[PDB]
Design a protein around this ligand. Structure first.
Ligand SMILES: *CCC(=O)N1CCC[C@@H](n2nc(-c3cnc4[nH]ccc4c3)c3c(N)ncnc32)C1
Length: 286
């Protein structure tokens, strides 16, 4: 409702675009251009997305859509938080908390499987964020995948990027069977979450031998659901949870309310996992 303000933590600072120094771009254009910037008044370093008024019409619709969800989700601790906005005659700047890395780049830096104790805390955060979006807003994400799961140096794990979210098409590799072949898609992000967990738990994407998008959709419908390997020491609860996410018939796929009662969730809802120190170790490679 208000622009021209930054609220780092619990402190409000009147701010304009010229009060921030550009520390370079964070390379990708998933939604729009994202800059890493420094608040010269306090020294904090933040992420700012620049939306030009002359930019692509389709791209700007998604950037505003994503901002609409983020502003409404201010009270969800598993969703990324907007720090403020600046509106000029030619651009809109969206300030946001600076996270460390996404789960995709973490897998690339690790060059191998990601431990179960990290994926447990990630599962709890992603399930509760989706559950929050359905219940408090009737919004489904429609694009759950490791590149939209962010982690930071303090160990926080948060969902981001709601540019194609719906209020009741994503990447073909993570699309649920019913999204590919509709009979609805209320339980479709659950399938994407299970595909993402199998990928991070093994370091290998389950459909990695496909050369076109359509071939991936064919293997999703024709093959059995990709299982969690049984000789990597994974606990019975981790295997049981992924099997439930990856039910092929969406009618039999469990609900968010039922998934939040799984023994895999109850375990990591209360366990003390030092994901902050495990993060600093991965970031200190290569
Ligand atoms: C694998 C993750 C990745 O490479 N990303 C693409 C480049 C930018 C990375 N990133 N994006 C944001 C972000 C998300 N949503 C927004 N709405 C308004 C402003 C933003 C910014 C990031 C933040 N906040 N911190 C760290 N990295 C970020 C994702």
């Amino acid at each position: 409702k208000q622009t021209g303000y930054l609220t780092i933590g619990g402190q409000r600072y009147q701010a304009e675009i010229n009060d921030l120094e550009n520390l370079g771009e964070m390379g990708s254009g998933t939604c729009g251009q994202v800059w890493k910037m420094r608040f010269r008044k306090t020294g904090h370093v933040i992420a700012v997305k620049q939306m030009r008024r002359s930019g692509n019409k389709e791209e700007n619709k998604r950037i505003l859509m994503d901002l609409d969800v983020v502003l409404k989700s201010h009270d969800c601790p598993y969703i990324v938080q907007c720090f403020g906005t600046f509106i000029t005659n030619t651009d809109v700047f969206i300030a946001m908390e600076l996270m460390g890395t996404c789960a995709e780049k973490l897998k690339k830096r690790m060059q191998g499987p990601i431990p179960e104790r990290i994926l447990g805390k990630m599962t709890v955060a992603i399930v509760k964020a989706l559950y929050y979006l359905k219940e408090k807003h009737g919004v489904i994400h429609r694009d759950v995948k490791p590149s939209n799961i962010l982690l930071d140096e303090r160990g926080q794990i948060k969902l981001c990027d709601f540019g194609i979210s719906g209020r009741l098409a994503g990447c073909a590799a993570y699309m649920a069977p019913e999204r590919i072949d509709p009979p609805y898609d209320i339980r479709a992000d659950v399938w994407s979450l299970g595909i993402s967990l199998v990928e991070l738990a093994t370091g290998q994407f389950p459909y990695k031998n496909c050369k076109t998008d359509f071939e991936v959709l064919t293997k999703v419908l024709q093959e059995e659901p990709p299982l969690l390997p049984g000789h990597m020491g994974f606990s019975g609860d981790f295997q049981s949870f992924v099997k439930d996410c990856l039910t092929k018939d969406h009618r039999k796929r469990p609900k968010y309310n039922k998934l939040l009662e799984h023994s895999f969730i109850k375990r990591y809802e209360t366990l003390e996992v030092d994901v902050a120190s495990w993060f600093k170790d991965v970031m200190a490679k290569t």
